């Protein structure tokens, strides 16, 4: 009989400073949430109350806000060290700044094991990272040992910039020998901590024999048993119970994203390291839990650098800039419309944009003041808006891909400019596009004329889509001409200043049967 | 066996200086048309070829271009005197500058009879304007007399500001005693010259016993026998033959508008002043007819004052600003979209605009340069964009009115901003609106939601529509609140400068089944 409490965050994405209800910049501080300082209070509060506790992270601490743009990992290592994190799995966004952008700020400065069993190293890089990350860590909790095995998304080479001298083996295949190794090492209790998404977490739980619990991330999954405290609608109960082939009931947990919730999972274990009972719920980190003062003071010490890099007004918004996943990945969101307008205004009649790239909404309640900061949250990656030459057939395929797996918060949903697309989800994937009228360019007056397969159109789109990202291989493998455009933020920054006061709308660009 | 040639212009609307194929400012002078100087050449050319000729005008020289804004009638009297016009009927736009702004520049300076039989004067104005205009004029042509009887639109009190001491009696009723008078005065030939439109011209021809020929205007009707020389599609043959009740075939003519065509009509008359034969066609005044040099020199000697009209680009257009009647009064024209955007940007989610108020397109081929001159052609009246508070039922009625007599180049067709209307012309007038989704204002993110009858909307529209013009009595008799807005031109002038480079489009705001 042993009691362990697992506390977990996943996909925080640089929300060190407290955010709004929608994870945008904290506007109303009385009705504000999350943050590293507020989490310190709840973590500390749990730590004293429970006997054996583990604060874990399932990746994606990188990107999302100006904190990352400025410190590039210095904030993550400093504040995760401050919060005394027990362990963290490598996320796909941890490789965004190349291999050194992982080695120099985080891997060298972290006072905690950073894990990953399915990443193997070769050649020059082989000895550089050797020992900086481990496949597993056997933490001594009380008078028991707990083995944590890490894993990072198999698709990280596509999804980010991990490098050429790192190899991403299959999760379940690379995890099993490491779990079996730990079992022989008399490690009765195995947590698997990884960044591969909910569906992959569930088969890990069902397939990897010996994993007592799965703590994942990547997909921003929100799980809840009961009536949720906020706008987040749950995908299942907390914990999600997977019945392994072993005959065990393996709990699977996720904490949404942006440090809005601290995942709490209490576990009763037997003499042999088997879950007898488990229960919990992700704790909503809201104003009812005070931000720890000493830790918040350090955030303010690290804020004056961030202040200079976004302490002035660029434009004003009278509409709420809806840059939320719930809207931008399922329907035409006004933020996507704004960015597309900004793109064409920077030069072409068509713009295409992956909803996945819309990382943050912008709140108009702060009188509409749109600062450099509000916006480096919407566009945190520093890509560009590149010119392309596409065939009508090529564009029809991309729209077909746009809703190929619709309804799974995937980022391949397109936000458009100068395109009027209508979808029918009742039909089979591959024949769901019902209309695609595009804005004419040879014409003297622009009018929407249906797309012709055999005609060549000039579309402006992010570097990510030109690179063939989000599975848009047809764009990369069928384009006629690609051109290096201007920096993504500066396209929206120059447009906002030019407009002075903005007000985009859902005007029927994307429609559904 | 008498031969009379009637030469006629109608609705020139201040196109003294030659214009483009679309009556906008002359861009390419080698492919340019119309104008007072070019007309002088063709008129003089006809005059020396034919024996008995009459140069007549059926109204509307006033308003249209900056020539009228600056000289307010000095140009009309000076150049019509130069062109040696024989007679002119009063048009509805002649009263645009009140009753004094007609008498002071034109009525006192014209070296030709200005006619109108259906305008009667009362009280103070009675003796002021006594003799300045006449109901008829008996011109001596060769060794014969020709009686011309004038008429101005019955609805001029609504259509413009004709003062308060002028009374507009019915045309056919006021014309008949004057034609009967002339017949008793032994005046065998009667040509009726008036500004009431084509349909009214045809009933005048059928009904007023004794009228040998009708030469009209107001409706910009283009008539042609054969293959037309330009974009103007004809409404009938030239001359249009009306069969009068007293067994005569009465010819009816019109020469489109803007001085693009000089209407030519050949007439064989009998001993008793009866048309035996008649034939003609409106002559396309193009570069193939040279502009008379002496007269063009005078146009340039005056032009010098008009030159200080923003001879610097307020803004640039990359699209052709389609401000033509053919588009703006039948479908959603990009010019109407531009003005509506300018109105909401000015200071509300909805804008409505009468297509009639779009008096001129703007040509983007002149390096895209938009000047105060160009804008004065689109918006020549000096109205204002007023705020209104109308209920859904009231707006639904206005949209029904919009297409109540659709297809007759009437100005009550609405151009919109933040409104998405769909019409079905197959249905009965009063049941023609199938969709009317409006842009929400109480919402945080603007989205198009269907209009509710019992809800109030805050629409921005011209003062012309607010004081119930174009038969939109429902606007004037059902509004909840009206507010004095900014000047029409200055709303578009401030918007263009703010945007720097504009590019409106036909984006589906107005649609049809
Ligand atoms: C230049 C491109 C910048 N990046 C990052 C990035 C990509 C690839 C390399 C990279 C360099 N190289 C080497 C070139 F030689 N190979 N590869 C680097 C960085 C990106 N840009 C845009 Cl526009 N969108 C991006 C994006 N990354 C991701 N999304 C979106 O994120 C969505 C998922 O979001 P989520 O569910 O919260 C899961 P997670 O992102 O929280 O892990 C997707 O559907 C995408 O649409
Ligand atoms: C402040 C309003 C300015 N005006 C002029 C005007 C109206 C009325 C008074 C007037 C002052 N008052 C007194 C107020 F206390 N009563 N009445 C003066 C001037 C106007 N404004 C706008 Cl927005 N549109 C106008 C307009 N006039 C006409 N259209 C349009 O012209 C179309 C027809 O064009 P057409 O076929 O070429 C025939 P014609 O105009 O060549 O004769 C119509 O359908 C209208 O839409
Ligand atoms: Zn993430
Ligand atoms: Zn991730
Ligand atoms: Zn006219
Ligand atoms: Zn008229």
Cβ atoms B455, B391 nearer than 8 A: yes
Cα A474 to Cα B222: distance, rounded to the nearest angstrom: 54
Which stretches does DSSP call E strand in A207-299? 213-216, 240-243, 249-253, 261-269, 275-280, 283-284
Strand ranges (DSSP E) for B382-440?
A: 384-391, 414-417, 419-423, 433-439
Give chain A's largest Cα–Cα span: 80
Name the burial class of residue A127, with classes exposed (0-12), middle (13-18) and buried (19+) by CB atoms within 10 angstroms of its CB: exposed
How would you class B508 by CB atoms within 10 Å of its CB: exposed for 0-12, middle for 13-18, buried for 19 or more? Answer: middle
| Pair A215, A56: CB distance under 8 Å | yes
Task: Report the b/e string of B299-334 with b at 16+ CB within 10 A.
Answer: beebeeebeeeeeebbbbbebbbbbbbebbbbbbbb
CB-CB contact of B115 with B87 (8 Å): yes
Ligand 4 centre distance from Cα of residue A10 (Å): 9
At B450, list the tokens.
């269907």
Do the Cβ atoms of B161 and B63 come closer than 8 Å? no
- Indicate where chain A has its CATH 3.60.21.10 domain(s): 2-301
Q: How was this structure determined?
A: X-ray
Task: State which fold the B310-512 domain adopts.
Answer: 5'-nucleotidase;  domain 2 (3.90.780)
Residue of chain B nearest A506, judged by CA positions: B447
Q: What is the Cα–Cα distance from B81 to B61, expressed in whole angstroms? A: 13
The answer to whether residues B38 and B8 touch, using CB atoms and an 8 Å cutoff, is: no
Which ligand has its closest atom nearest to the C-alpha of B95? 2
Q: Closest Cα to residue B37, out of B303, B431, B235, B356?
A: B303
Spell out a b/e string for B456-478, using b for 16 or more CB atoms within 10 Å of the CB, else e: ebebbbbbbbbebbbebebbeeb
How many angstroms does the Cα of residue A226 sit away from the middle of ligand 5? 72
Selected from 3.40.50.620, 3.40.1350.10, 3.40.50.300, 3.60.21.10, the CATH number assigned to the domain covering B2-304 reads 3.60.21.10
Q: Tokens at residue B296, please?
A: 């063009």
Residue B111 CA from chain centroid, whole number: 24
Asked if A448 is an interface residue toward chain B (Cβ–Cβ < 8 A), one would say yes
A234 neighbors A226 (Cβ within 8 angstroms): no
The C-alpha of B4 sits at a distance from chain A's nearest C-alpha, in angstroms, of 45
**DSSP letter for each residue of A21-74:** TTSSB--SSTT-B--HHHHHHHHHHHHHHSSSEEEEE-S--SSSSHHHHHHTTH
Task: Check the annotation: does B381 bind a ligand.
Answer: yes
Q: In terms of Cα–Cα distance, which of A146, A159, A376 is closest to A269?
A: A146
Report resolution (Å) to 1 decimal.
Answer: 2.9
Ligand 1 geometric centre to CA of A435 (Å): 29
Which of A320, A439, A444 lies nearest to residue B444, judging by beta carbons? A320
Q: Which of A445, A500, A505 faces B447 most closely, judged by CB atoms? A: A505
Q: Which of A246, A234, A235, A236 is nearest to A275 (CA)?
A: A246
Nearest CA in chain A to B362: A445
The alpha-carbon gap from B29 to the nearest alpha carbon of chain A, in Å, equals 20
Minimal Cα–Cα distance from B186 to chain A, Å?
58
CA of A154 to the centre of ligand 3 (A): 15
CA nearest B361 in A: which residue? A445
- Identify any residues that bridge with A3 across adjacent strands, giving them in sequence order: A268
> A–B: how many Cβ contacts below 8 A?
50
Q: Which ligand is nearest to the CA of B358?
A: 2
Q: What string of DSSP letters covers B227-266? A: S-SSSPPPSB-SSEEEE-TTS-EEEEE-B-STTSEEEEEE
Instruction: Tell me which ligand sits closest to the C-alpha of residue B325.
Output: 2
Pick from B319, B444, B446: CB nearest A445: B319
Q: How far apart are CA A467 and CA A452, in angstroms?
A: 24
Across the beta sheet with A249-253, what order do the strands follow? Answer: A136-141, A144-152, A190-195, A213-216, A249-253, A240-243
Scan for tokens 């839990």, then name that residue: A289
* Coil vs helix vs strand at B335: helix
C-beta neighbour count of A253 within 10 angstroms? 27
Q: CB contact, 8 Å: B447 with chain A? A: yes
| Rounded Cα–Cα distance for residues B196 and B185 (Å) | 26
Q: Is the CB of B380 under 6 A from ligand 2?
A: no
Q: How far is the CA of A496 from the centre of ligand 4 (A)?
A: 30
Ligand 1: residue whose CA is nearest its atom 31 = A356
**How far apart (Å, rounded) are the C-alpha atoms in residues A496 and A316?**
8
A204 CA distance to ligand 6 centroid (A)?
A: 81
A212 touches chain B (CB under 8 A): no
Least Cα distance to B146 among B240, B273, B244 occurs for B273
Asked if residue B464 has its Cβ within 6 Å of ligand 2, the reply is yes
Distance CA B460, CA B467 (A): 13
Residue of B nearest to A334 (CA): B445
Facing B505 at nearest CB: one of A439, A505, A507: A439
B364 and chain A in contact, CB less than 8 A: yes
Phi first, then psi, for residue A221 (nearest 5°) are -70, 135
CB-ligand 2 contact for B60 (6 Å cutoff): yes
Contact A24, A374 (CB under 8 A): yes
* Gap from B505 CA to chain A (nearest CA, Å): 5
Closest ligand 1 atom to residue A329 Cα is 44
3-state SS, residue A1:
coil
SS3 label, residue B179:
helix
CB count within 10 Å of CB A144 equals: 15
Answer yes or no: is the C-beta of B64 below 6 A from any ligand 2 atom: no
> CA-CA distance, B380 to B475, in Å (whole number)?
23
Task: Scan for tokens 């340039």, then name that residue.
Answer: B300
Give the fold, CATH level 3, of A2-301: Purple Acid Phosphatase; chain A, domain 2 (3.60.21)
Q: What is the β-pairing status of strands A384-391 and A481-487?
A: antiparallel
Tokens of B270: 């009998």
What distance lies between CA B415 and its chain's CA centroid? Answer: 19
Domain A312-512 in CATH 3.90.780.10? The answer is yes
Alpha-carbon span B323 to A418, nearest angstrom: 22
Torsion sign (Cα): B287, B293, B295, B301: positive
Please indicate whether, in this complex, the C-beta atoms of A319 and B444 are within 8 angstroms of each other. yes
> From the CA of B464, how far away is ligand 2's center (Å)?
7
A420 touches chain B (CB under 8 A): yes
Set of chain B residues whose Cβ sits within 8 Å of the Cβ of A447 = 505-506
* Option in B320, B445, B504 nearest A319 (CB): B445
Breaks (C-N over 2.5 A) in chain B follow: 347
Residues 6+ apart with CB under 8 A from B300: none
The tokens describing A246, both together, are: 């072993």
Q: Sheet holding A419-423: strands in order across?
A: A448-450, A433-439, A419-423, A510-512
Cβ–ligand 2 distance for B462 under 6 Å, the answer: yes
CB contact under 8 A, A334 and B445: yes
How many other C-beta atoms lie within 10 A of the C-beta of residue B360?
28
Chain-chain contact of B448 with A319 (C-beta, under 8 angstroms): no
Longest distance between any two alpha carbons in chain B, whole Å: 80
Could you tell me where in chain A the CATH 3.90.780.10 domains are found? 312-512
Contact assessment for residue B148 and residue B56, using Cβ atoms and an 8 Å cutoff: yes
C-beta atoms of A320 and B445 within 8 A? yes
CA distance B321 to chain A (A): 8
Contact of B363 with chain A, judged by CB distance below 8 Å, is answered with no
Separation of alpha carbons B27 and A15, rounded Å: 58
Residue spans in chain B of domains classed CATH 3.90.780.10: 310-512
> Nearest 5°: CA angle at B297, between B291 and B301?
140
Residue A179's closest CA among A166, A190, A171?
Answer: A190
Residue A469 main-chain phi, psi, to 5 deg: -65, 175
């Amino acid at each position: 009989m042993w009691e362990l409490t697992i506390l977990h965050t996943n996909d925080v994405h640089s929300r060190l400073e407290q955010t709004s209800e929608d994870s945008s910049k904290c506007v109303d501080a009385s009705r504000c949430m999350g943050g590293v300082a507020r989490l310190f209070t709840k973590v500390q509060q749990i730590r004293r109350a429970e006997p054996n506790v583990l604060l874990l992270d399932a990746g994606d601490q990188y990107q999302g806000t100006i904190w990352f743009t400025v410190y590039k990992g210095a904030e993550v290592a400093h504040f995760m060290n401050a919060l005394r994190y027990d362990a963290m799995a490598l996320g796909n966004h941890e490789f965004d700044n190349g291999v050194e952008g992982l080695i120099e700020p985080l891997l060298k400065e972290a006072k905690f094991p950073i894990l990953s069993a399915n990443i193997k190293a070769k050649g020059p890089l082989a000895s550089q990272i050797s020992g900086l990350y481990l496949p597993y860590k056997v933490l001594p909790v009380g008078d028991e040992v707990v083995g944590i095995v890490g894993y990072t998304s198999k698709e990280t080479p596509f999804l980010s910039n991990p490098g050429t001298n790192l190899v991403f083996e299959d999760e379940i295949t690379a995890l099993q020998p490491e779990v079996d190794k730990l079992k022989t090492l008399n490690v009765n209790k195995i947590i698997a901590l990884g960044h591969s998404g909910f569906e992959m977490d569930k088969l890990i739980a069902q397939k990897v024999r010996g994993v007592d619990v799965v703590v994942g991330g990547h997909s921003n999954t929100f799980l809840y048993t009961g009536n949720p405290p906020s706008k987040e609608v749950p995908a299942g109960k907390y914990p999600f119970i997977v019945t392994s082939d072993d005959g065990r009931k393996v709990p699977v947990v996720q904490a949404y994203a942006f440090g809005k919730y601290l995942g709490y999972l209490k576990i009763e274990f037997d003499e042999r390291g088997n879950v007898i009972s488990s229960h919990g719920n992700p704790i909503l980190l809201d104003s009812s839990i005070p931000e720890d003062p000493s830790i918040k003071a350090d955030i303010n010490k690290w804020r004056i650098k961030l202040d200079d890099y976004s302490t002035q007004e660029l434009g004003k918004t009278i509409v709420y800039l809806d840059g939320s996943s719930q809207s931008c990945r399922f329907r035409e969101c006004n933020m996507g419309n704004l960015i597309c307008d900004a793109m064409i205004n920077n030069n072409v009649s068509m713009c295409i944009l992956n909803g996945g790239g819309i990382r943050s909404p912008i709140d108009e309640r702060n009188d509409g003041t749109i600062t450099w900061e509000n916006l480096a949250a919407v566009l945190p990656f520093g890509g560009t808006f590149d010119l392309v030459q596409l065939k009508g057939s090529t564009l029809k395929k991309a729209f077909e891909h746009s809703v190929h797996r619709y309804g799974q918060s995937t980022g391949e949903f397109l936000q458009v400019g100068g395109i009027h697309v209508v979808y029918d989800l009742s039909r089979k994937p591959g024949d769901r596009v019902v209309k695609l009228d595009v804005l004419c360019t040879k014409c003297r007056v622009p009018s929407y004329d249906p797309l012709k397969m055999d005609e060549v159109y000039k579309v402006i789109l992010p570097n990510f889509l030109a690179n063939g990202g989000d599975g848009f291989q047809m764009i990369k493998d069928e384009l006629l001409r690609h051109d290096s455009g201007d920096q993504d933020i500066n396209v929206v920054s120059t447009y906002i200043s030019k407009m002075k006061v903005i007000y985009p709308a859902v005007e029927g660009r994307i429609k559904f049967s």
